[PDB]
Scaffold this active site. Structure first.
Site, PDB file in Angstrom:
ATOM      1  N   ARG A 189       0.757  -1.619   0.209  1.00 44.95           N
ATOM      2  CA  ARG A 189       0.026  -0.020   0.186  1.00 44.95           C
ATOM      3  C   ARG A 189       1.350   0.991   0.352  1.00 44.95           C
ATOM      4  NH1 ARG A 189      -4.259   2.646   3.341  1.00 44.95           N
ATOM      5  NH2 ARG A 189      -3.414   3.740   1.101  1.00 44.95           N
TER       6      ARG A 189
ATOM      7  N   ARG B 236       1.007  -0.427  10.254  1.00 42.75           N
ATOM      8  CA  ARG B 236       2.513  -0.325  10.789  1.00 42.75           C
ATOM      9  C   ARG B 236       2.636  -1.360  11.229  1.00 42.75           C
ATOM     10  NH1 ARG B 236       0.401   3.222  12.014  1.00 42.75           N
ATOM     11  NH2 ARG B 236      -0.193   3.039  14.805  1.00 42.75           N
TER      12      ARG B 236
ATOM     13  N   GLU C 291      -0.287  16.918   6.624  1.00 44.94           N
ATOM     14  CA  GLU C 291       0.509  15.184   6.138  1.00 44.94           C
ATOM     15  C   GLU C 291       0.022  14.909   5.000  1.00 44.94           C
ATOM     16  OE1 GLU C 291      -3.465  12.833   8.082  1.00 44.94           O
ATOM     17  OE2 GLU C 291      -1.458  13.151  10.249  1.00 44.94           O
TER      18      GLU C 291
ATOM     19  N   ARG D 141      -2.369  17.031   2.845  1.00 46.26           N
ATOM     20  CA  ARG D 141      -3.605  16.385   4.176  1.00 46.26           C
ATOM     21  C   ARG D 141      -3.753  17.044   4.848  1.00 46.26           C
ATOM     22  NH1 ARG D 141      -4.399  10.185   5.027  1.00 46.26           N
ATOM     23  NH2 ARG D 141      -5.871   9.883   6.391  1.00 46.26           N
ATOM     24  N   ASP D 142      -4.804  17.942   4.970  1.00 42.92           N
ATOM     25  CA  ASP D 142      -5.314  18.277   6.861  1.00 42.92           C
ATOM     26  C   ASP D 142      -6.279  17.482   7.457  1.00 42.92           C
ATOM     27  OD1 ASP D 142      -5.955  19.418   8.647  1.00 42.92           O
ATOM     28  OD2 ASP D 142      -6.678  21.305   8.270  1.00 42.92           O
TER      29      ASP D 142
ATOM     30  N   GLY E 167      -9.536  20.203   7.448  1.00 47.03           N
ATOM     31  CA  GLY E 167      -9.694  20.621   6.492  1.00 47.03           C
ATOM     32  C   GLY E 167     -10.175  19.513   5.287  1.00 47.03           C
TER      33      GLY E 167
ATOM     34  N   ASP F 259      -9.857  16.936  -0.933  1.00 46.83           N
ATOM     35  CA  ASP F 259      -9.921  15.694   0.187  1.00 46.83           C
ATOM     36  C   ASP F 259     -10.905  14.445   0.063  1.00 46.83           C
ATOM     37  OD1 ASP F 259      -8.160  13.883   2.008  1.00 46.83           O
ATOM     38  OD2 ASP F 259      -8.269  15.894   3.263  1.00 46.83           O
TER      39      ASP F 259
ATOM     40  N   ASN G 244     -10.198  12.570   9.506  1.00 46.30           N
ATOM     41  CA  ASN G 244      -9.861  11.776   8.258  1.00 46.30           C
ATOM     42  C   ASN G 244      -9.549  12.132   7.512  1.00 46.30           C
ATOM     43  OD1 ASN G 244      -9.930   9.336   7.095  1.00 46.30           O
ATOM     44  ND2 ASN G 244     -12.583   8.698   7.284  1.00 46.30           N
TER      45      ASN G 244
ATOM     46  N   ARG H  45     -13.303   6.459  -0.408  1.00 46.69           N
ATOM     47  CA  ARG H  45     -11.753   5.793  -1.246  1.00 46.69           C
ATOM     48  C   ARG H  45     -12.568   5.654  -2.896  1.00 46.69           C
ATOM     49  NH1 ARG H  45      -7.227   4.928   2.874  1.00 46.69           N
ATOM     50  NH2 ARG H  45      -6.700   7.349   3.862  1.00 46.69           N
TER      51      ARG H  45
HETATM   52  C1  LIG Z   1       2.310   6.462   9.296  1.00 44.37           C
HETATM   53  C2  LIG Z   1       0.717   5.904   8.719  1.00 44.37           C
HETATM   54  O1  LIG Z   1       0.422   5.316   9.933  1.00 44.37           O
HETATM   55  N1  LIG Z   1       0.122   6.379   8.345  1.00 44.37           N
HETATM   56  C3  LIG Z   1      -1.144   5.884   8.081  1.00 44.37           C
HETATM   57  C4  LIG Z   1      -2.136   7.488   7.358  1.00 44.37           C
HETATM   58  C5  LIG Z   1      -1.781   7.944   9.140  1.00 44.37           C
HETATM   59  O2  LIG Z   1      -2.779   7.037   9.801  1.00 44.37           O
HETATM   60  C6  LIG Z   1      -2.882   9.401   8.585  1.00 44.37           C
HETATM   61  O3  LIG Z   1      -1.834   9.690   7.382  1.00 44.37           O
HETATM   62  C7  LIG Z   1      -2.811  10.401  10.361  1.00 44.37           C
HETATM   63  O4  LIG Z   1      -2.077  10.778  10.559  1.00 44.37           O
HETATM   64  O5  LIG Z   1      -3.339   7.193   6.545  1.00 44.37           O
HETATM   65  C8  LIG Z   1      -3.884   5.854   6.602  1.00 44.37           C
HETATM   66  O6  LIG Z   1      -4.119   4.584   7.431  1.00 44.37           O
HETATM   67  C9  LIG Z   1      -4.733   5.642   5.531  1.00 44.37           C
HETATM   68  O7  LIG Z   1      -5.553   6.824   5.904  1.00 44.37           O
HETATM   69  O8  LIG Z   1      -5.228   5.087   4.618  1.00 44.37           O
HETATM   70  C10 LIG Z   1      -2.373   4.459   5.618  1.00 44.37           C
HETATM   71  C11 LIG Z   1      -1.027   4.997   6.536  1.00 44.37           C
HETATM   72  O9  LIG Z   1      -0.244   3.983   6.491  1.00 44.37           O
HETATM   73 CA   LIG Z   2      -9.170  16.044   6.254  1.00 45.48          CA
END
Ligand SMILES: CC(=O)N[C@H]1[C@H]([C@H](O)[C@H](O)CO)O[C@@](O)(C(=O)O)C[C@@H]1O
Ligand SMILES: [Ca+2]
Ligand SMILES: CC(=O)N[C@H]1[C@H]([C@H](O)[C@H](O)CO)O[C@@](O)(C(=O)O)C[C@@H]1O
Ligand SMILES: CC(=O)N[C@H]1[C@H]([C@H](O)[C@H](O)CO)O[C@@](O)(C(=O)O)C[C@@H]1O
Ligand SMILES: CC(=O)N[C@H]1[C@H]([C@H](O)[C@H](O)CO)O[C@@](O)(C(=O)O)C[C@@H]1O
Ligand SMILES: CC(=O)N[C@H]1[C@H]([C@H](O)[C@H](O)CO)O[C@@](O)(C(=O)O)C[C@@H]1O
Ligand SMILES: CC(=O)N[C@H]1[C@H]([C@H](O)[C@H](O)CO)O[C@@](O)(C(=O)O)C[C@@H]1O
Ligand SMILES: CC(=O)N[C@H]1[C@H]([C@H](O)[C@H](O)CO)O[C@@](O)(C(=O)O)C[C@@H]1O
Ligand SMILES: CC(=O)N[C@H]1[C@H]([C@H](O)[C@H](O)CO)O[C@@](O)(C(=O)O)C[C@@H]1O
Ligand SMILES: CC(=O)N[C@@H]1[C@@H](O)[C@H](O)[C@@H](CO)O[C@H]1O
Ligand SMILES: CC(=O)N[C@@H]1[C@@H](O)[C@H](O)[C@@H](CO)O[C@H]1O
Ligand SMILES: CC(=O)N[C@@H]1[C@@H](O)[C@H](O)[C@@H](CO)O[C@H]1O
Ligand SMILES: CC(=O)N[C@@H]1[C@@H](O)[C@H](O)[C@@H](CO)O[C@H]1O
Ligand SMILES: CC(=O)N[C@@H]1[C@@H](O)[C@H](O)[C@@H](CO)O[C@H]1O
Ligand SMILES: CC(=O)N[C@@H]1[C@@H](O)[C@H](O)[C@@H](CO)O[C@H]1O
Ligand SMILES: CC(=O)N[C@@H]1[C@@H](O)[C@H](O)[C@@H](CO)O[C@H]1O
Ligand SMILES: CC(=O)N[C@@H]1[C@@H](O)[C@H](O)[C@@H](CO)O[C@H]1O
Ligand SMILES: CC(=O)N[C@@H]1[C@@H](O)[C@H](O)[C@@H](CO)O[C@H]1O
Ligand SMILES: CC(=O)N[C@@H]1[C@@H](O)[C@H](O)[C@@H](CO)O[C@H]1O
Ligand SMILES: CC(=O)N[C@@H]1[C@@H](O)[C@H](O)[C@@H](CO)O[C@H]1O
Ligand SMILES: CC(=O)N[C@@H]1[C@@H](O)[C@H](O)[C@@H](CO)O[C@H]1O
Ligand SMILES: OC[C@H]1O[C@@H](O)[C@@H](O)[C@@H](O)[C@@H]1O
Ligand SMILES: OC[C@H]1O[C@@H](O)[C@@H](O)[C@@H](O)[C@@H]1O
Ligand SMILES: OC[C@H]1O[C@@H](O)[C@@H](O)[C@@H](O)[C@@H]1O
Ligand SMILES: OC[C@H]1O[C@@H](O)[C@@H](O)[C@@H](O)[C@@H]1O
Ligand SMILES: OC[C@H]1O[C@@H](O)[C@@H](O)[C@@H](O)[C@@H]1O
Ligand SMILES: OC[C@H]1O[C@@H](O)[C@@H](O)[C@@H](O)[C@@H]1O
Ligand SMILES: OC[C@H]1O[C@@H](O)[C@@H](O)[C@@H](O)[C@@H]1O
Ligand SMILES: OC[C@H]1O[C@@H](O)[C@@H](O)[C@@H](O)[C@@H]1O
Ligand SMILES: OC[C@H]1O[C@@H](O)[C@@H](O)[C@@H](O)[C@@H]1O
Ligand SMILES: OC[C@H]1O[C@@H](O)[C@@H](O)[C@@H](O)[C@@H]1O
Ligand SMILES: OC[C@H]1O[C@@H](O)[C@@H](O)[C@@H](O)[C@@H]1O
Ligand SMILES: OC[C@H]1O[C@@H](O)[C@@H](O)[C@@H](O)[C@@H]1O
Ligand SMILES: [Ca+2]
Ligand SMILES: [Ca+2]
Ligand SMILES: [Ca+2]
Lengths: 388, 388, 388, 388
Positions: free
Chosen positions: D37, D71, D196, D212-213, D217, D244, D266, D290
């Protein structure tokens, strides 16, 4: 194009950062991944690679049954791209055999594989991917070597071999190779009483090997080699922080010149970086099995028989399987110092997990950071139940 | 960039060290390994590779059924990295056909594949991976060639072909190629009465081929070629140590200029190194089938009709399957002499193991050592029962 | 490093020798081989490769169901090493789409893929593996191109496209590309009445394309292109040896400037070499389906409306499936003439073999010999029953 | 061999042409394709590649169960050839971790991977495929970065990181790297309130990132970076065309300096090209999930709080799954302008398709054309039912 010289000191080790991880057992559940053990890592001037002893079969293959055994005609030293798994399709065979070492001298690579029956083994020394020198067993009892990379200085690459008993005095020799040819060899000297599976690194024109005393020692023996004079000494890590396995509990005082007693006729390949206050030891967390893995900062471990940890980092939790560990560095990196690295072999299957008929492993490796980085733990990650 | 010349003599052969082994059948039980037979090994100036005739199907594939047959439209000469298995994904096609030879001249590689029906076959000669010359069948009866590497000297690469009966007189020709083009060809001369599957090597500007007399001979015929004059002679190994298969028991006196009788219309590809006292013969251990493999030091085997072994080494136990064997050397290695090498094809499946519907093989190869090394045996290692 | 010029004439074609064969369907029964169709072959100065339109799925994969369809978002031009199968692991994507051409100009390669819905397709022209030029549909009805290699002269690589009806007049254009950029384009001229899937080759600064008249013609149309003047003409093969499929029976007189009638709204991609007496035509053996394949020597086929065969060679038996066929040559080979080559697509599966839900193919190719070589036939070789 | 400088402006974007598509989920149904992903695309001077975060398991593998999680210790940044799938056998590991960026500076590549537990993560910065710099978490809450390529100018490659809350104020820093070493870093400034997953591109010595806010946002924040002065500003896209997801319905007036409200906590990674009238925004078609993907020409989107679309192109139908999207360009292409490109991640499996236990994706990417090309839609193409 010129031979590499060990002109740099070690970088200051304030923590360990993740370097590579192949997740081989997880991946090999459903892809053509070779069964291995006795892995390591080694760099060329343009590339760093994973190395191991293949068992000449995939993990899902029916021939994975019986791969607990160390020595067969189906084993080979293979290498493959860093953090990839050792697959049938990407693995490069360095030589045939069941005990090995390998190192690049700045111009090209030497690889050494030993094969044969227990009473009649022989080493073949390859250089520039051609066989150059052969050495017949001298004690007729499992001729064997480091199971991790050797180190070169101005073309001279010393290698530690042992032949003879695993449970008594044996005959260890230090061979000094240049372009695959024997310049010199010496019998082991100093106060180390038994030597196996040396893990070596180089800095400031000196090569330091931390080895395994299988016969008596739960402290680790150390050989230090002068690759210019082609001479060596040996002793033990003085520290009471004991780093073999299995081992008794840590005392408050170690032994500098004798095996620390309590456990006989067993051990595990391991390593250390011995650099005054910049000294770090690896060990299994468990005293009883190849379980967990940690790094401990033990100032002056080599020379201080009361030295205790001042800092650490967990690498593998005590609730996860580890295995062999050993040293390598990228001698061709930029900068003013050599960055210490190591790998840990994460053994899965037999004998600890006997619902499967195989034994294999994956790899994790780290290098040192001058930052004080946060820690994670790094397990193999496979579910044995999936293989049932 | 210049043509290689055969300027060196053979190194002294005091024993044989392990060089390569692919464990292809063990591995191919659970990975995408091509069905092969008729393998060999051949070096370029920068790399040595395994070669064989693919059957255009994997071993686990349903199309492996019927691969006992030698000649189909689905066969090809493939090469792959040394000691890797011949997989779908790492195998390089050299040309299409069911009989082959290949060799590097110092500048680039010539490969030759023959294809066609029995009464209408043709050779195509590739050079620098392009087709250059074609030769139509001359006797309309399975045009066929060496099944192991050719040898070049100053750009001239002779090749032995046979066309005609396998059970009677046939028409053997020696073609002298340079850059894929025919400089000259000659009909077979001397006292060899039938020639097939020549295994060749080069030293001191002379090329020696040990071949198969399928019609009458259990001693092996020998062609020696002068690649400068582009002329040859032929005779048999005089030695009573008989090296074809099947064969009668060894006598005390061989035949220099005629087939040693007792077995008709059968044989196996094999090889020797004929170098005065430095003479070593390979043979199957069994007189009856392609079973076991040994090397025997037989001083003056070529010229001494009473010569017997003075030394040996078992390569494959008589309780394990062997097959074809042939010669190659790394003509581009360092040093003052050429190190003799050979491979043995380890055939599995039909006809000896008929619970499977396929026939394939793996490879083991050795090169000579000036040491007196201990011996191991080197079986294929697969369990046929796994394929059931 | 300099643009290739077409400075040589064709070599004399006395027969056809085997060049390559991938046995893809046989192999892909038990390995990760991509479903393809519309294959061809094309050379770079250092390497010749197989090309085809992937269907974005393996043959054993469940997504192979429905691959009879020509145009989806999952197709791509892929290339892979000569005589290897197109596998997931060795196939290189040239561009995305469901109609393609590709050719090397001596410096680097141009590849063209068309994608989109039927009423809104577009070509993208890649050069040195980067997108450079795009061309939108002009007739809003399946913009489409050659399905075999283009040909370059001094950097100019003409390409034939058609847009519009398959069953009526359509709009064919000749685009003259240089470094991926449009130098010029022309609408089709001369007497060819419908053009599709041109198979092209080059000699003596002229490019000859043999195409498919889908609408009316069972004789094949021919476009000849001057890549210096950037002009062309068109006509039909005059010969009564008719080479499209399906087709009526051969008459005794063809048509030079009109479609030979009897079959409407269907055809197959094919090719010829038109070179005075050195003229050879390919055709399916069957008049009714894509079955069998032969080469026929038909002196002056292009210009002689009564020309009949004087020589032939069977390539595929009438009891085996064929398919598309097309021309390529190694413009970078040694020697004084260009050696004519061709491939035949061997289609398996739907619609002729409907017990499987897929359609794919393998490849066989031949080049010309100045010898009169014996013939074999070259079927796909797979057993459909194995896939059930 | 010299550092690349951003000396060109964007090419005029009149439409989007297909650039690459790997069809990974379709293919991986029956081949050894890694679960991924967070993909992207990034070019070297000689090659453009696909990138993603492996999950250290194949899709058909039993370890694909649980890969919805972001993660783990089994993730890595991998790259592979353009439009190929990420397979076990062709995927190259860039570094270990669960958040990444990568970019080539004209001389060599920098890659950055973050790993660790949520409260103790660290970035390691690789340059020329060696680890050079490490950065420890500063806010002890999932240190994370772009998930698409960075951009370099004269050796300086800025990177946007965030550490801290996803649902409240956080600590975003801009690091200016050169040869893997930190030249400078700054805390986020300007009017963007949460940052982000920045998608960045470069033109005329300025780097523009659309981010990404996550907190408040539904308009996207924008950071613009001067890589010479090593300074930045931030704001939001003023446009009422909100990009977004999830998001409320489009209003008639946006917000330039604050988050457009209606949806909290989100979002999705996305991108834009902001270039006066040559401005194009990507968004999901759905406001709720999505799902679908379109490009919209919104002149002056960045600065005009009432700007509405004047042109568009559908990329993915609203009846097909999309995902993350981001920017890259081939900075080493020929010509006078930089051609804008983007990819869309096509997520399959969980949480939207929960009959499977995995989550993965395939990739589609497009680059801009100066033509007005016809449109197709580009779905993943796999049938989930096949995996049941
Ligand atoms: C480092 C990390 O875990 N990034 C994850 C982010 C964060 O959770 C968001 O940016 C919130 O900070 O978003 C996902 O969950 C998603 O939305 O598909 C996938 C991604 O792997
Ligand atoms: Ca947003
Ligand atoms: C050459 C050889 O057999 N080496 C084996 C060694 C030796 O048995 C010991 O070092 C005692 O000498 O240790 C292992 O068994 C082990 O402990 O995991 C594995 C290894 O393959
Ligand atoms: C990976 C693992 O599960 N390790 C466990 C091991 C092993 O179960 C046995 O040592 C093997 O026999 O046992 C412990 O008591 C130990 O030795 O410290 C605790 C640890 O949790
Ligand atoms: C070209 C050809 O068919 N060669 C075949 C030869 C010939 O049959 C013999 O040399 C008799 O001429 O031998 C084999 O059958 C064999 O003995 O294993 C295998 C080989 O493929
Ligand atoms: C590999 C193997 O099992 N070889 C055995 C062979 C074969 O069984 C038959 O020769 C084949 O028919 O037979 C022997 O008697 C022989 O020939 O010397 C003994 C040997 O142990
Ligand atoms: C672009 C395209 O769809 N080409 C297809 C063409 C056209 O349908 C015809 O040339 C009529 O125009 O022919 C095929 O169907 C065929 O006959 O096997 C295959 C090919 O993929
Ligand atoms: C490969 C194959 O089997 N070909 C056969 C074909 C096909 O069966 C049909 O043409 C398809 O419908 O039919 C023939 O009558 C023909 O057309 O000449 C004979 C030929 O043997
Ligand atoms: C790919 C797909 O099927 N998308 C559909 C989605 C999803 O089903 C849900 O949004 C997920 O919960 O729902 C829609 O109403 C929407 O959001 O516009 C319509 C669209 O057809
Ligand atoms: C890379 C390098 O500098 N290697 C040097 C080599 O050139 C020199 O010959 C040798 C002895 O002085 O020490 C080492
Ligand atoms: C930089 C630092 O503080 N590292 C410490 C380490 O020494 C200690 O072993 C570990 C467990 O307490 O926590 C951490
Ligand atoms: C909250 C927490 O776990 N903090 C750990 C700390 O104990 C450890 O000392 C440090 C370096 O290893 O990583 C962090
Ligand atoms: C590698 C090499 O030295 N090859 C030599 C070649 O240069 C020489 O032309 C030829 C005839 O003398 O003999 C050979
Ligand atoms: C160097 C040496 O002694 N080799 C001998 C070999 O000649 C003999 O054939 C074999 C079996 O006895 O044992 C060994
Ligand atoms: C105890 C034993 O098996 N020794 C063997 C010996 O017989 C053989 O001669 C030698 C060389 O091949 O290898 C060793
Ligand atoms: C390989 C080669 O010779 N290509 C030549 C090129 O050098 C020349 O510029 C051109 C026009 O004369 O014709 C072509
Ligand atoms: C060189 C030669 O004689 N070729 C002939 C060929 O022309 C003929 O079509 C075929 C079938 O008879 O047999 C062959
Ligand atoms: C006996 C036989 O089949 N001979 C064929 C002949 O008919 C054919 O002309 C020639 C060239 O194609 O190949 C051979
Ligand atoms: C590819 C290229 O031209 N890079 C130039 C570099 O040579 C120059 O040193 C730098 C500063 O002027 O700007 C950039
Ligand atoms: C060049 C062109 O006309 N593009 C239009 C596009 O702007 C529009 O969004 C789409 C749907 O109507 O149809 C198309
Ligand atoms: C008939 C049809 O679908 N035409 C479409 C048009 O709506 C769209 O504007 C254009 C560019 O995207 O592609 C074409
Ligand atoms: O587990 C690591 C160390 O922890 C504590 C003691 O039990 C030691 O003997 C042990 O080696
Ligand atoms: O005592 C040595 C070290 O032991 C542990 C920690 O308490 C450290 O702070 C201390 O410095
Ligand atoms: O502060 C020193 C301490 O660091 C932490 C662990 O590594 C302990 O083993 C060690 O005693
Ligand atoms: O088996 C090798 C040799 O052993 C003994 C005799 O039986 C010979 O005839 C035979 O060839
Ligand atoms: O007789 C030749 C050889 O035969 C055998 C052994 O006994 C050797 O020692 C001996 O030299
Ligand atoms: O000593 C010679 C002997 O060596 C051993 C074996 O190879 C015997 O075949 C041989 O006679
Ligand atoms: O089959 C090849 C040729 O054979 C004969 C006739 O039936 C022709 O019409 C046909 O095209
Ligand atoms: O008639 C043209 C050709 O036709 C056929 C054969 O009979 C050939 O010998 C003949 O030359
Ligand atoms: O001799 C010419 C003959 O050659 C053979 C076949 O190719 C026939 O079609 C042809 O007529
Ligand atoms: O779906 C794309 C756009 O279509 C319309 C409105 O529903 C918008 O709010 C939406 O974002
Ligand atoms: O109004 C902006 C655009 O909106 C939509 C179409 O109707 C376009 O023709 C128009 O230009
Ligand atoms: O003409 C502008 C129109 O183009 C089309 C679509 O992209 C619409 O969203 C847009 O409003
Ligand atoms: Ca011990
Ligand atoms: Ca015989
Ligand atoms: Ca037609």
């Amino acid at each position: 194009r010129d031979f590499n010289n060990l002109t740099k000191g070690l970088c200051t080790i304030n923590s360990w950062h993740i370097y590579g991880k192949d997740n081989a057992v997880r991946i090999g559940e459903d892809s053509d991944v070779l069964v291995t053990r006795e892995p390591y890592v080694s760099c060329d001037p343009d590339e760093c690679r994973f190395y191991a002893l293949s068992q000449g079969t995939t993990i899902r293959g029916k021939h994975s049954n019986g791969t607990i055994h160390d020595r067969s005609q189906y084993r080979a030293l293979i290498s493959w791209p860093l953090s990839s798994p050792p697959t049938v399709y990407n693995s490069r065979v360095e030589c045939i055999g069941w005990s090995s070492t390998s190192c690049h001298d700045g111009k090209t690579r030497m690889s050494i594989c030993i094969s044969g029956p227990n009473n009649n083994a022989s080493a073949v020394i390859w250089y520039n991917r051609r066989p150059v020198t052969e050495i017949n067993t001298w004690a007729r009892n499992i001729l064997r070597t480091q199971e991790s990379e050797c180190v070169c200085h101005n073309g001279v690459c010393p290698v530690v071999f042992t032949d003879g008993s695993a449970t008594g005095p044996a005959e260890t020799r230090i061979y000094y190779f240049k372009e695959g040819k024997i310049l010199k060899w010496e019998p082991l000297a100093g106060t180390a009483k038994h030597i196996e599976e040396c893990s070596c690194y180089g800095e400031r024109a000196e090569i330091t090997c931390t080895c395994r005393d299988n016969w008596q020692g739960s402290n680790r023996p150390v050989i230090r080699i002068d690759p210019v004079a082609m001479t060596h000494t040996s002793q033990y890590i003085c520290s009471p922080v004991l780093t073999d396995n299995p081992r008794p509990n840590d005392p408050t005082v170690g032994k500098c010149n004798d095996p620390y007693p309590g456990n006989n006729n067993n051990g595990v390949k391991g390593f250390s970086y011995l650099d005054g206050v910049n000294t770090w030891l690896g060990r299994t967390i468990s005293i009883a099995s190849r379980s967990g893995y940690e790094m401990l900062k033990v100032p002056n471990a080599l020379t201080d028989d009361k030295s205790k940890p001042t800092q650490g980092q967990t690498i593998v939790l005590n609730t996860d399987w580890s295995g062999y560990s050993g040293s390598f560095m990228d001698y061709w990196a930029e900068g003013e110092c050599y960055r210490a690295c190591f790998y840990v072999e994460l053994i899965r299957g037999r004998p600890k997990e006997d619902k499967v008929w195989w034994t294999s492993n994956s790899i994790v490796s780290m290098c040192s950071s001058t930052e004080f980085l946060g820690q994670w733990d790094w397990p193999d990650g496979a579910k044995i139940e999936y293989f049932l």
